[PDB]
Paper text:
[name] ([name]-[name]-2) is decorated with spikes, and viral entry into cells is initiated when these spikes bind to the host angiotensin-converting enzyme 2 (ACE2) receptor. Cao et al. designed small, stable proteins that bind tightly to the spike and block it from binding to ACE2. We set out to design high-affinity protein minibinders to the [name]-[name]-2 spike receptor binding domain ([name]) that compete with ACE2 binding. Unlike antibodies, the miniproteins do not require expression in mammalian cells, and their small size and high stability may allow formulation for direct delivery to the nasal or respiratory system.
The best designs bind with very high affinity and prevent [name]-[name]-2 infection of mammalian Vero E6 cells. Cryo–electron microscopy shows that the structures of the two most potent inhibitors are nearly identical to the computational models. The very close agreement of the cryo-EM structures of LCB1 and [name] with the computational design models suggest that the main challenges to overcome are not in the de novo design of proteins with shape and chemical complementarity to the target surface, but in recognizing the best candidates and identifying a small number of affinity-increasing substitutions. The large amount of data collected in protein-interface design experiments such as those described here should inform the improvement of the detailed atomic models at the core of Rosetta design calculations, as well as complementary machine-learning approaches, to enable even faster in silico design of picomolar inhibitors such as LCB1 and [name].
Author numbering:
A (entry chain A): 1 to 64
B (entry chain B): 334 to 527
């Protein structure tokens, strides 16, 4: 679902910016947010899913 | 003179979480048995007080802070918790005294095409103070270069919407949340049980 996915995206962004101990991390996370925001508005499901996948890998690395 | 709980729990519209609505209750009879035993609530968590003893207490004030949040975020409406809601939208103090009541409102706040009228704050410069209502729409400054009020590269409108559609899974359902904050300071104790 597109709306569930958007809500997931924002959760990943919040956590990613919580554990973003390095400034470079924050920059990457913000970039990904911008891409997701655009994809959401234009109903591009594949692009939005791709950002979410990238955010998950990012966050998993930060947490582990 | 009964307390206007029917104006809180049965409200036609709940406020968005970024701008929660505080209803002050005083000088009335507060029957809490109807709220505890309603059996329509999925969450009923009290801090500093036992749910079944509420009718035996009298209060200086009762404040009902009402708002809509997402199912997975219900766990953040508690003292000592963190997360985007606990930190940027609705912060409860570590010594919070009161009861947090929530229920699944999918059949009320979710339209077939999706209800997008509920907003939350995703970006903020710092964490909220307990019970602070930040309803500013100033563009969030993510980068080092001043945004000057315009959205763009490393500049964001701080509020996001909740896409609540009726086909969502449980964690993505809307929940109506009412937090009853209790003041038990020396006072006339104007609002209390029957
Ligand atoms: C919140 O409202 C419910 C039900 O809504 C009211 O009753 C409907 C029949 C209709 O007239 C609505 O416009 C009203 O707002 C209340 O639940 C009722 O409680 C009474 C008393 O115990 C019981 O006899 C009824 O059968 C219940 N009806 C239903 C549908 O549950 C509920 O008590 C209200 N809660 C608060 C805090 O006001």
């Amino acid at each position: 679902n597109d709306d569930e996915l958007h809500m997931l995206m924002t959760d990943l962004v919040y956590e990613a910016l919580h554990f973003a101990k390095d400034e470079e991390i924050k920059k990457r996370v913000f970039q990904l947010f911008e891409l997701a925001d655009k994809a959401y508005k234009n109903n591009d499901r594949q692009k939005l899913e791709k950002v979410v996948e990238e955010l998950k890998e990012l966050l998993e690395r930060l947490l582990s | 003179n009964l307390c206007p709980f029917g104006e809180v729990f049965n409200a036609t519209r709940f406020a968005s979480v970024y701008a929660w609505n505080r209803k002050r209750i005083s000088n009335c009879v507060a029957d809490y048995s109807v709220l505890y035993n309603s059996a329509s609530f999925s969450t009923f968590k009290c801090y500093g007080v036992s749910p079944t003893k509420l009718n035996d207490l009298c209060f200086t004030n009762v404040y009902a802070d009402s708002f809509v949040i997402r199912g997975d975020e219900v766990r953040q409406i508690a003292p000592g918790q963190t997360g985007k809601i606990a930190d940027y939208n609705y912060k409860l103090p570590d010594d919070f005294t009161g009861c947090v009541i929530a229920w699944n409102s999918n059949n009320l706040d979710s339209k077939v095409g999706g209800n997008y009228n509920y907003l939350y704050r995703l970006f903020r410069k710092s964490n909220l103070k307990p019970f602070e209502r930040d309803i500013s729409t100033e563009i969030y400054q993510a980068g080092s270069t001043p945004c000057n009020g315009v959205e763009g590269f490393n500049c964001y409108f701080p509020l996001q919407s909740y896409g609540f559609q009726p086909t969502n899974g449980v964690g993505y359902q809307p929940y109506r949340v009412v937090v009853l904050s209790f003041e038990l300071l020396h006072a006339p104790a104007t609002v209390c049980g029957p």
